[PDB]
Swiss-Prot record:
It comes from Saccharomyces cerevisiae (strain ATCC 204508 / S288c) (Baker's yeast). GO terms for biological process: protein N-linked glycosylation; protein N-linked glycosylation via asparagine. The chain holds residues 30 to 185 of 332 of the full protein. Changing residue 52 to S: Alters glycosyltransferase efficiency towards a subset of target proteins. This is Dolichyl-diphosphooligosaccharide--protein glycosyltransferase subunit OST6. Its main location: endoplasmic reticulum. The gene is OST6. Residues 6-133 form the Thioredoxin domain. Disulfide bonds join 49-52.
């Protein structure tokens, strides 16, 4: 699993690719998998996803807080771009973006059946109103990961 951990970029997040998707989608025993499903470029109509762009910053801000304040937490953060990994789009039956989903680790006795495409997940609904709400997103992850964190806020 040391191979998967080394995939983290300088922000502590792992980019899903067509090549690595089959491996990553089978999980790491004991680890939560937080997956941001997004679209960074322009679509077929030359339009950009503003919500995708805005929440990606929120995503990274909260990931940074969790990495710093909860070093023991067994979690992995991932991003995937729907234009880059067609098998994931197919497997997860994606029809729109963005999505933020969290897979808990499979129970030890059910490990071999873990796959992103079939395993239960929590979803954090994304809308313009919460695109920049780091407090709320942090609270969501804190509850799932059973941690206590303090995200720096604009409002104090």
């Amino acid at each position: 699993i040391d191979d998967i951990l080394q995939l983290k970029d300088d922000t502590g997040v792992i980019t899903v690719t067509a090549d690595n998707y089959p491996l990553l989608s089978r999980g790491v025993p004991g680890y939560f998998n937080i997956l941001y499903i997004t679209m960074r470029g322009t679509n077929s109509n030359g339009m950009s996803c503003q919500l995708c762009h805005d929440f990606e910053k929120t995503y990274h801000a909260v990931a940074d807080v969790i990495r710093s304040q909860a070093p023991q937490s067994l979690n992995l953060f991932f991003t995937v771009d729907v234009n880059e990994v067609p098998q994931l789009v197919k497997d997860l039956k994606l029809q729109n973006v963005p999505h933020l989903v969290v897979y808990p680790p499979a129970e030890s006795n059910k490990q071999s059946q873990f796959e992103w495409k079939t395993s239960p997940f929590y979803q954090y609904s994304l809308v313009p109103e919460n695109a920049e709400n780091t407090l709320q997103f942090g609270d969501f992850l804190a509850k799932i990961l059973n941690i206590s964190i303090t995200v720096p806020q604009a409002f104090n």
